[PDB]
Design a protein around this ligand. Sequence first.
Ligand SMILES: CC(C)CCC[C@@H](C)[C@H]1CC[C@H]2[C@@H]3CC=C4C[C@@H](O)CC[C@]4(C)[C@H]3CC[C@]12C
Lengths: 111, 277, 125
Amino acid sequence: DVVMTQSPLSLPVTLGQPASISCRSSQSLVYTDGNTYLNWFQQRPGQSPRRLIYKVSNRDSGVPDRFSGSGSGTDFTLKISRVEAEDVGFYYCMQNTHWPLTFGGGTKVEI
Amino acid sequence: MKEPCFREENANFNKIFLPTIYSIIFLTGIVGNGLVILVMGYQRSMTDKYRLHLSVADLLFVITLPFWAVDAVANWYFGNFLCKAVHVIYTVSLYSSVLILAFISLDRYLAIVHATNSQRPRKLLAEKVVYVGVWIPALLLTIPDFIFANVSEADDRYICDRFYPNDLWVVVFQFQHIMVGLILPGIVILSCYCIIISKLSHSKRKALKTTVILILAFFACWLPYYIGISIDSFILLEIIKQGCEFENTVHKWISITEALAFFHCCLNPILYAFLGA
Amino acid sequence: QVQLVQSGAEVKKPGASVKVSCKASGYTFTSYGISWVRQAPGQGIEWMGWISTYNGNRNYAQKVQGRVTMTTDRSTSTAYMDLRSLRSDDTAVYYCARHGITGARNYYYHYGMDVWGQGTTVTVS
Ligand SMILES: CC(C)CCC[C@@H](C)[C@H]1CC[C@H]2[C@@H]3CC=C4C[C@@H](O)CC[C@]4(C)[C@H]3CC[C@]12C
């Protein structure tokens, strides 16, 4: 129902330099109570996905301070202020405002 | 085989309309009940003695309201023990007022129907029996509130609610609520009044009319809420199948009629101010 | 601690049936719902279904509807997923997540996906 487009498909970055992944939805992800529910997932190879950020820019417990999220409406962005050796993996953005939920295409961060 | 219906919330109706009503009810009820208790306790008849108990029962509900209003506006920051305490206090104050009304009806029946030898059982009943018949059953009926009322965390949101294993305890306790609050005291009150009116047909009215007005107002503030509860329980049993928008409509109307019924903690000081006591 | 444990990896013939479990521990099982998702090798993550452990309300995706069924067990606090009429396209990794919240006066779907299972690899050949 709601398609999510991610960019770029592959993001080769160097250690110590910032990285940005941007995804945009087909519709406006604003619920009837004024809140936006878009969250970001990180998947390491051989493990189940792990959240990083929820509700556009709210971080979970245990995630570092490097990760941050922004954007509102129909364009959202994830930024890593300093890429480390443990950030390699797949990144997805998922919206939970319209039934049913949908996932992003997925971007591979290459050290 | 059944599709789910999720509840709907909007920032304009809930978060603005409900806190304002809760605040108005809180200020009115606290002022009225404080004045009534201050006047009665530290300056009577027996109806005044039962109305002091009604005022005390209303104070607990008024105290409980600042928690629901804050939960509606921002969040539930008050922990887990306070969740159980709020639920228990709400249930006690809900169940301990209709029983006092029934006791008032019984007192009026004894005073008017017999009028020859009733001061002794009226005394005994008022002092000894109200404690063991109004408050103790009300306290005993709060065990499910002790057990099933918990706070749960989802994302960054804490919610205080009654979490049952499945949707049939909800029906069971709604039917228990209806039966305890509306039928047996209702039967007692309407039979005492039927026998009084039958006795006084061939024939005092300054207190009888006041008590009748109080009981009618109390039972008219709660009727739409009971109708909504009955409709909801008949939907949970899957006896009424009319789509998914009907369920949202009835849920909204249950919320509205609950907000309306929360005005029962102000009737006693209004019939004190207007009728002149 | 809050966790979900799934069954093992498994290989099935075409036309067979797959019954995969998901046991929850560390939290009240009946206060949330369980969402079943799959990820194919070299493909994106795709939603498959949602079941309410509270009142047994379920919803399947349109793509997989007609072949998938879901059930729960309160006494053992587990959730199952049965997929029938398997094809070679069903070779994937299936994940189990805690999705939604279902209480007496709260029945929402936009809370959750906090905790997930380890996933089971189903190979259809
Ligand atoms: C757990 C919380 C809700 C306490 C439950 C018990 C409460 C509801 C009961 C316990 C003892 C009761 C009190 C016993 C005696 C009196 C004196 C009377 O002239 C007015 C009512 C009043 C003041 C009662 C009000 C209700 C009361 C306070």
